[PDB]
Design an enzyme around this catalytic site. Structure first.
Site, PDB file in Angstrom:
ATOM      1  N   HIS A 127       1.615  -7.492   2.852  1.00 42.77           N
ATOM      2  CA  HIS A 127       0.993  -8.773   2.510  1.00 42.77           C
ATOM      3  C   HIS A 127       1.992  -9.924   2.423  1.00 42.77           C
ATOM      4  O   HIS A 127       1.871 -10.807   1.572  1.00 42.77           O
ATOM      5  CB  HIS A 127       0.211  -8.653   1.214  1.00 42.77           C
ATOM      6  CG  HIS A 127      -1.160  -8.082   1.393  1.00 42.77           C
ATOM      7  ND1 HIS A 127      -2.102  -8.093   0.388  1.00 42.77           N
ATOM      8  CD2 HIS A 127      -1.749  -7.486   2.458  1.00 42.77           C
ATOM      9  CE1 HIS A 127      -3.214  -7.529   0.830  1.00 42.77           C
ATOM     10  NE2 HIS A 127      -3.023  -7.146   2.078  1.00 42.77           N
ATOM     11  N   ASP A 168      -3.297   3.972   6.815  1.00 38.59           N
ATOM     12  CA  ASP A 168      -3.049   2.594   6.420  1.00 38.59           C
ATOM     13  C   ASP A 168      -1.578   2.396   6.093  1.00 38.59           C
ATOM     14  O   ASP A 168      -0.923   3.292   5.536  1.00 38.59           O
ATOM     15  CB  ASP A 168      -3.910   2.180   5.229  1.00 38.59           C
ATOM     16  CG  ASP A 168      -4.223   0.692   5.229  1.00 38.59           C
ATOM     17  OD1 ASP A 168      -3.517  -0.081   5.926  1.00 38.59           O
ATOM     18  OD2 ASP A 168      -5.185   0.302   4.539  1.00 38.59           O
ATOM     19  N   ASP A 184      -0.211  -3.269   8.054  1.00 34.69           N
ATOM     20  CA  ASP A 184      -1.529  -3.457   7.489  1.00 34.69           C
ATOM     21  C   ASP A 184      -2.537  -3.406   8.612  1.00 34.69           C
ATOM     22  O   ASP A 184      -3.022  -4.459   9.030  1.00 34.69           O
ATOM     23  CB  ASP A 184      -1.622  -4.773   6.748  1.00 34.69           C
ATOM     24  CG  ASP A 184      -2.282  -4.614   5.438  1.00 34.69           C
ATOM     25  OD1 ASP A 184      -3.106  -3.680   5.308  1.00 34.69           O
ATOM     26  OD2 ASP A 184      -1.923  -5.387   4.531  1.00 34.69           O
ATOM     27  N   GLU A 191     -11.772  -5.277   5.628  1.00 37.19           N
ATOM     28  CA  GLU A 191     -11.127  -4.612   4.499  1.00 37.19           C
ATOM     29  C   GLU A 191     -10.579  -5.621   3.491  1.00 37.19           C
ATOM     30  O   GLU A 191     -10.661  -5.403   2.279  1.00 37.19           O
ATOM     31  CB  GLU A 191     -10.020  -3.697   5.026  1.00 37.19           C
ATOM     32  CG  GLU A 191      -9.407  -2.719   4.018  1.00 37.19           C
ATOM     33  CD  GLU A 191      -8.379  -3.343   3.139  1.00 37.19           C
ATOM     34  OE1 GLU A 191      -8.004  -4.495   3.411  1.00 37.19           O
ATOM     35  OE2 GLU A 191      -7.958  -2.690   2.157  1.00 37.19           O
ATOM     36  N   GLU A 192     -10.022  -6.730   3.964  1.00 31.98           N
ATOM     37  CA  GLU A 192      -9.183  -7.591   3.136  1.00 31.98           C
ATOM     38  C   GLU A 192      -9.971  -8.511   2.211  1.00 31.98           C
ATOM     39  O   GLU A 192     -11.124  -8.921   2.488  1.00 31.98           O
ATOM     40  CB  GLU A 192      -8.278  -8.448   4.013  1.00 31.98           C
ATOM     41  CG  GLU A 192      -7.334  -7.631   4.897  1.00 31.98           C
ATOM     42  CD  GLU A 192      -6.155  -6.981   4.144  1.00 31.98           C
ATOM     43  OE1 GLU A 192      -6.166  -6.871   2.893  1.00 31.98           O
ATOM     44  OE2 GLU A 192      -5.212  -6.570   4.851  1.00 31.98           O
TER      45      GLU A 192
END
Ligand SMILES: COc1cc(N(CC2CCCC2)C(=O)NCCCn2cncc2C)ccc1OCCN1CCOCC1
Ligand SMILES: [Zn+2]
EC number: 2.3.2.5
Length: 321
Positions: free
Chosen positions: A290, A208, A123, A161-162
């Site tokens: 994740h 990504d 990630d 981004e998250e």
């Protein structure tokens, strides 16, 4: 009319000895130690690692001999936790040049609560490191662009981004929603005759979630199809010369198949403004995605190096170098 050059650009495909030069001129060993390992830290927006992550990037970019123009784009935006600061990194060659090929990654990690910390190896950490390596590897060839089509290279390391709390249109892609709009408003080139920095984007190649072993990347968008097929041809012609490691032609990375749904990523704010996107994300996602098992031990050094090589040839073909 130059905004429409992107639609017609053609590569200049490298010969076999050149492919033999670029495969030795990059090495996952240096990438692992010098570029990837320092970013294996907690680095959510506005964190201590976020600054250390950002200064790692820019330092390595200034080690290089090609005259990269660095730009930090700090800005405020609302999040479910009140008003936060985010700083995208943007490295540029030939800022005066009308058209840019853009390789993109996000450098923030996601905030998590046993005895293990979330470093987002795939990630972002590997893809952002792969962008560092390519610049170190191709340095001697990028240095050729300093001396003078009107096309050059741009590196973007998005922030935020998250999701902070729960992934939603409002709690997502902070850094790229802002930087798209900022680019849609910034006059490019300095002449400012009705063109934007968004218009100067040839292609957004967004990396990504790459480090995992055995990735298959779908072809998401018709208007980038031919460049996805150049990625197939590049992977074929590296394997055929025996330049890929532990690579088999039956389990390849770039397979033709289409993708039906949509994945939300940092490309989405630019796709909505007519930027041709090449979204180098695998489907299915890495099994570690994740979870704090997302780490160096579950990365495949050999897969990453093959992809380093494949990407470095793509932009050396794209840029007619
Ligand atoms: C393809 O796959 C997955 C995609 C997604 N969608 C699609 C929508 C989600 C609900 C409706 C459709 C998505 O917008 N996602 C954004 C996350 C982006 N993002 C976060 N960090 C880096 C990035 C790019 C959701 C889940 C998916 O599957 C995960 C399953 N995996 C779990 C563990 O690993 C193996 C399988
Ligand atoms: Zn993520």
């Amino acid at each position: 009319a130059w905004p429409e050059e992107k639609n017609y650009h053609q590569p200049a495909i490298l010969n076999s000895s050149a492919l033999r030069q670029i495969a030795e001129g990059t090495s996952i060993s240096e990438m692992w130690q010098n570029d990837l390992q320092p970013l294996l830290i907690e680095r959510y927006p506005g964190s201590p690692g976020s600054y250390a992550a950002r200064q790692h990037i820019m330092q390595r970019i200034q080690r290089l001999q090609a005259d990269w123009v660095l730009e930090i784009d700090t800005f405020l935006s609302q999040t479910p936790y009140g008003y936060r600061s985010f700083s995208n990194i943007i490295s540029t060659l030939n800022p005066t040049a009308k058209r840019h090929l853009v390789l993109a990654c996000h450098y923030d990690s996601k905030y998590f609560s046993n005895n293990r910390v979330f470093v987002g190896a795939t990630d972002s950490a590997v893809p952002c490191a792969m962008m560092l390596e390519l610049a170190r590897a191709l340095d001697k060839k990028l240095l050729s662009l300093k001396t003078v089509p009107d096309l050059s290279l741009q590196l973007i390391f998005f922030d935020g981004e998250e999701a902070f709390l729960h992934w939603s249109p409002q709690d997502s892609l902070y850094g790229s929603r802002h930087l798209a709009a900022k680019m849609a408003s910034t006059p490019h080139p300095p002449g400012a005759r009705g063109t934007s920095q968004l218009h100067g984007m040839d292609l957004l190649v967004l990396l990504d979630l790459i480090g995992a072993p055995n990735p298959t990347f779908p072809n998401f968008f018709p208007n980038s199809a031919r460049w996805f097929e150049r990625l197939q041809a590049i992977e074929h012609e590296l394997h055929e010369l025996g330049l890929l490691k532990d690579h088999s032609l039956e389990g390849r990375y770039f397979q033709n198949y289409s993708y039906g749904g949509v994945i939300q990523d940092d490309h989405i704010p630019f796709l909505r403004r007519g930027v041709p996107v090449l979204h180098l994300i695998p489907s299915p996602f890495p099994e570690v995605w994740h979870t704090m098992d997302d780490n160096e031990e579950n990365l495949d050094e050999s897969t990453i190096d093959n992809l380093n090589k494949i990407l470095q040839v793509f932009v050396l073909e794209y840029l007619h170098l």
